[model samples]
Structures are given as structure tokens and as C-alpha cells.
Target: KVFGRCELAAAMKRHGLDNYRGYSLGNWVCAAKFESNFNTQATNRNTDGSTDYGILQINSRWWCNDGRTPGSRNLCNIPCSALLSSDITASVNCAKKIVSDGNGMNAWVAWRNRCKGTDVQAWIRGCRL
Candidate 1:
């Protein structure tokens, strides 16, 4: 599933992630944009042989079970495909758990490389919520 920036912002707000874990909605939006372009079904294999899943491109190595990567921690206890749902609830919850584990958004390489230290506000420009 794909979402416009505003639509994704609204969903994030509803998920109580507007300012979650000391990160702003802009940070989340910016990361999601670069990670998957708001495509919930997005998946990518990393050079390390692990897969990233969903809008946040969560890693299979520690987050979820992709049924392919070995020794998965499955910290999220969710199947990777569940992250691809348009609902986004499970993904948001898992993301919060990840942040609580101390990585914050840095867990996503896309955030560190592109969204970090940038004017992320543009990601939610014109969004009311």
C-alpha cells in the first residue's frame, strides 16, 4: 500500500508517533519516504544478507521473521509480511519497541543517511495534523 505524505502523517499521528521517542513526525516521515516511499509492501535485501521489510524497512535479522534469514531474533514476534499491511498498526507498534531498545530511528540506515540532520519538516509540509 502506498500513501501520500499527508495520509501517512495522519496515520502516524493516530498511532501516537507524532513525537514518539524524542523524534518528530518529520523524522518518521522523512525516514519512511526514503526507506520505502510510503509503500507498505516494500522489501529489500541488504548486503549483509538480511531483508528489510515494510515502510520502515525493518530488518529481518532482529525485528521479524522473514522465514529465510537464519537466527532471527524476531523481537517484534511478527511475521515480516504483517508489516506490509496497509493498516500500519503492527508496524508502528514494532517501531516503538525498537526505539525503546535504544537504537531510536538510527536502526534504519535510511534515516541516518538521509533524514538525519536535515530539514525533515518538508516531509510533512501542508499536513494539518
Candidate 2:
């Protein structure tokens, strides 16, 4: 499922991602946009042999258990499949935990690459949310 910008923003806010750990809604949206284009079923493989799951591109190496990444820690204690669901509540919850770490949103390479220095406000400019 692909999410529209405002509804995605609303969902993230409802799940406690708005200004979460000092990251704004635009920050989150920007990451998701680059990471997955708001595509819930988005999945990608990392060079380390781990996989990124869902809209937030959560890593199976540390976050969820895809049951395939060697030495997987499954820190979120959530199934990787849950991250792909259109519901996205699980995705937001897990992302909240990820950003809470010392590295914060920097955990997402897409954010560092694209969202960090740009006009992030463009992420939510036309959204009423």
C-alpha cells in the first residue's frame, strides 16, 4: 500500500512520530519518501546481507526479525512481515524505537543523504495535517 502525504503524516502523528525525538513530521516524511516512496510493502537488501523493510526501511539486522539475517538481534521484537502491512501502526511504533537510539534519525541513511540539509518543509507544505 502506498500512502498519500497527508494521511501518512496523520498516521505518523497518531503513532507518535511527529517531533519524535526532536525530528519533525517533515523529517519523517522526507525519510519515508526517499526510503520507500510511502510504499508499505517496500523491501530492499543491504550489502551486509540484511534487509530493509517497510516504508521506514527498517533494518532486519537490528530492528525486526526477518529470520534470515545472520546474527539478527530483532531489537524491536517484531516480525518483519508486520512492517510490510498497510496498517503502518507497527511501522511507526518500530521507527519510534529506532530514532530513540543515540544516533536518532541518522539511523536512516536516506535521511542523512537527502532530508538533512534540504528544505524539509516541502514534505508537508501542501498537507493540511
Candidate 3:
């Protein structure tokens, strides 16, 4: 099912917590909306056999090797999908730890830099979440 505005907002609050600012949350929703349309199961193909996955649209092939029980490439090794399940708040909070370098702001910066010059860029800089 697609995420609604309230669901997205709660997820942002859970993941954003101390860092939550209305603007940033709005920016995050905007980016997530444009990136994967809030589809937690989203995936994309790469030249190689590997792929990216989840709401954050994380690149499992490249960044998956966290030396966890499951080799990083195999998202199944880590409950990656669970991180985007119905428990969006917990899922997002968990995913934030994985994608962020312990800094929610850094995640924001990364998204902004990667999506620079796009329509979301304007929102990214102004949003506070």
C-alpha cells in the first residue's frame, strides 16, 4: 500500500526525532516521494547482477557489505525490507541508522547533494526535518 501523508509524517518523526524540523520533514517526504513514491519495496537494476532496494532506495550491491550475518549485498542478510514494513516508524529509524553516518543532517545533505539541480533541491535546502 502507498504511504499516506500522516504515515509519512510519523515515520519522519520517528526517524528524525531530535532532528525533526517541519521543513526537513517536508523535504524528506518530497525526496522520498520523488525517489520511490514511498514504495518500500522499490528496486532498480544495475549493470551488474546486484540491485538497490527499499524506501531509501538503498544500493544493496555496493553498500550492503556491513559484515553482518548476511553479506551486505544480500539484503535478506539484514532485515532490510522489515525496515520499511508497516512499522514505518521503527523501520525508518532503523534504516536511518544504516544509511546515515549517525547524523540525520548528513543524510539530508547527501540527499540534497545527490539530487542537486532537481526540483527537490529547493525543498531540500529549505525543509527542516
Candidate 4:
């Protein structure tokens, strides 16, 4: 796992993600928890035949390449495996690009279904940041 909740919040803040694209750090924290439990190596197969990659669960169909998957837009222009690492630089950059592309956190189903419109602050509770 890349981080625990508080650690993740601090890391996100260090990466200048507190209010990125006008989304709150809390939102990202909550979404990350729901998506991957902060596991950098987490991966999930989607019903659409694509896969979600890494801590953010970026979709292979749009953001990265997983060798077995076809139709990857590869907008992030990095291998999907690049995201599945403790180093989150590539994932963060790609996530920023995705949010800037107008999807907001809605690009992540976890955000849309769980983090959105919720008291996400709890996700960062006890963080010293």
C-alpha cells in the first residue's frame, strides 16, 4: 500500500493536491480509500473488459495500457504498470490531467458513487496537515 489515510492526505498536500482543480483533498482521500484502500498495486477488472490501475484505479480504456486490453486511449501516455508502484508521481500527474480534462473526480466511479456529496472529511481525520 502506498499510504494510510493520514499519510495519503499529507502526501497529496505535499504534491499540491489540497485544492487541485477545485476539488478538495478530502474528496481525493475518500475516493482513494474506496478505490484501492491506498494500495498502489491494486488492480481491478472492469465489466467493460478494461481494468482499473493503481491507487486511483485509472481505467485502462482511457488512461493507460495493460497488455491484454485493447482500445486503450493511453491519454496518460504511460504504461499501466507505471501506476502500480509505490511512487505515485506518474499516477498523480495523470490524475491531474484527467481532472483538467473536465471530468473532475467524476472520472472515478468511486468518487461519483461514494465520495461525492459525502462527508469526506472523515477520510482525512487525524491527519496533522
Clashing pairs in 3: 23-127, 23-128, 24-127, 24-128, 24-129, 25-129, 64-72
TM-score for each candidate, following the candidate numbering: 0.96, 0.96, 0.56, 0.94
**RMSD in angstroms between candidate 4 and the native structure over all alpha carbons:** 1.2
Instruction: Give the candidates in order of TM-score, highest first.
Output: 2, 1, 4, 3
How many residue pairs clash per model? 0, 0, 7, 0
Q: Provide the overall lDDT of each model, using Cα atoms, as 2-decimal numbers.
A: 0.91, 0.92, 0.52, 0.88
Best by lDDT: 2
TM-score of 2: 0.96
CA lDDT of 120 in candidate 3? 47
**lDDT at position 84, candidate 4:** 91
Candidate 4 residues 1-129, lDDT tens each? Answer: 669889889888888787899988999898889999999999999888999989899988988887777766899999999999888888888899888997688998889999899998888888899
Q: Which candidate comes out best when scored by TM-score?
A: 2
Report clash pairs, candidate 1. Answer: none
Q: Which residue window of length 10 is worst by lDDT in model 1?
A: 99-108
lDDT by residue (20-113, candidate 3, tens digit) is 4323455566656655677776666556555555556555553443233234344334544454455555345544554454544334333566
Minimum summed lDDT over a 10-residue window in model 4 is located at 64-73
Query: In candidate 1, which residue ranges exceed 4 Å CA deviation?
Result: none
Tens-digit lDDT track for model 1 on 1-129? Answer: 999999999999999898898999999999899999999999999887889989888889999998888777899999999999999998999999987897788888889999999999999899988
